[PDB]
Design a protein around this nucleic acid. Structure first.
Ligand code: NA
Ligand code: NA
Length: 242
DNA sequence: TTTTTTCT
DNA sequence: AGAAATAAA
């Protein structure tokens, strides 16, 4: 139940989430690669834009983020919109709903142009405000999956280029979608937002850091490289969620 | 069917 | 509100 899950997640902690994020998560790896091949402001803008079109894919997330990272390394990007107009139709892993996706990028372009290095620093220290402002630029609910995910991926990009760590805000919930609905149904009849927000508050681990832990473990990523105590806690979580 | 969104 | 937007079998 929620109490046992929260206890184990609390023992894993933000420290354990950060371990998975920085050592195992393939989207973090892809971002690290791209961060060496393009200026840091363009990098962050691209990561947000990419997140906002990361729905209803034609591949797995890890394939898609690596396609993005390898595509943009070394490129000279002016307009994010024009870059995606060329990139998406020729991609392998994001071929559906392209006109809709391109229009989202066009709509957020002005907001992205505000992301100087300093503004990125400010948002990394106040990710709740970034969350609301991305949603407002798009005219959408900040609770929506791709807006939440754009904050998550912003957080990865900012950690890399700013070489500092701020935890995700507790108030930003896990991205809601078919895979969290399916996992949660195995565990409980409670609705996912309420369930995971309760677990986050009880464990002290913000929902987006919980998100980092869940998917590699469910997907069979090896936990063997974790030190013995963390490894034990990750093994216990696998017993609950897989 | 399984793997989010706009326009309003 | 809820029909429609696209790729794969
Ligand atoms: Na479309
Ligand atoms: Na908002």
């Amino acid at each position: 139940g929620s109490h046992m899950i929260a206890r184990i997640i609390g023992e894993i902690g933000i420290e354990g989430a950060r371990f998975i994020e920085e050592n195992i998560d393939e989207q973090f790896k892809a971002l690290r690669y791209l961060s060496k091949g393009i200026d840091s402001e363009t990098f962050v803008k691209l990561v947000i834009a990419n997140s906002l079109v990361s729905y209803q894919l034609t591949g797995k997330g890890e394939q898609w983020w690596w396609e993005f990272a390898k595509y943009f390394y070394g490129r000279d990007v002016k307009s994010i919109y024009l870059a995606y107009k060329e990139f998406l139709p020729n991609s392998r892993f994001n071929r559906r709903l392209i006109p809709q996706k391109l229009s989202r990028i066009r709509r957020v372009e002005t907001f992205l142009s505000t992301l100087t290095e300093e503004r990125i620093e400010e948002y990394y220290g106040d990710m709740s405000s970034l969350w609301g402002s991305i949603a407002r630029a798009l005219g959408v609910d900040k609770e929506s999956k791709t807006v939440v995910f754009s904050v998550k991926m912003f957080g990865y990009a900012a950690r890399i280029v700013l070489s500092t760590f701020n935890p995700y805000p507790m108030e930003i919930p896990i991205p809601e979608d078919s895979r969290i609905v399916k996992l949660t149904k195995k565990l409980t009849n409670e609705k996912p937002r309420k369930f995971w927000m309760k677990i986050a508050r009880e464990s002290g681990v913000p929902p987006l850091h919980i998100d980092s832990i869940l998917w590699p473990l469910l997907g069979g990523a090896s936990i063997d490289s974790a030190p013995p105590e963390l490894r034990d806690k990750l093994a216990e979580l696998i017993k609950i969620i897989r």
